[PDB]
Amino acid sequence: GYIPEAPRDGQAYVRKDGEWVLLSTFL
Amino acid sequence: GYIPEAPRDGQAYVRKDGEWVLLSTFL
Amino acid sequence: GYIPEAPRDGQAYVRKDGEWVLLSTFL
């Protein structure tokens, strides 16, 4: 389906496993 | 709600603050 | 329009060119 909004919290998110995961996880 | 399309412009985007932000911002 | 789900496969994706592209492409 379509993807719901990510957290709105001053952090960047990427799409993984049908979820929003912090970009910083990967950096 | 659901998220609208990001710019279609040859650049990658991540989701932040209910917006599409260039990935390159963080790299 | 709204964006469809990314692959659900243990990898992170970013939005580019109206598509889901592996984050690892850029790292």
Q: Which residues of B touch C27 (CB under 8 A)?
A: 27
Nearest to C16 among B2, B4, B11 (CB): B11
Q: What is the dihedral of CA C19, C24, C14, A9, to 10 degrees?
A: 170
For chain B, the domain total comes to: 1
Nearest to C5 among A1, A23, A27 (CB): A1
- A vs B, Cβ pairs < 8 A, gives 40
DSSP string, chain A: -BPBPPP-SS--EEEETTEEEEGGGG-
Euclidean distance between CA atoms C27 and B3, whole angstroms: 25
Q: Which residue has the tokens 């989701």?
A: B15
Experimental determination approach used: X-ray
Question: Cα distance from B18 to chain C (closest Cα, Å)?
Answer: 14
CATH code of B5's domain: 1.20.5.320
Residue B20: give the domain boundaries: 1-27
Q: To what resolution in angstroms was this structure determined? A: 1.1
CB A15 within 8 A of CB C12: yes
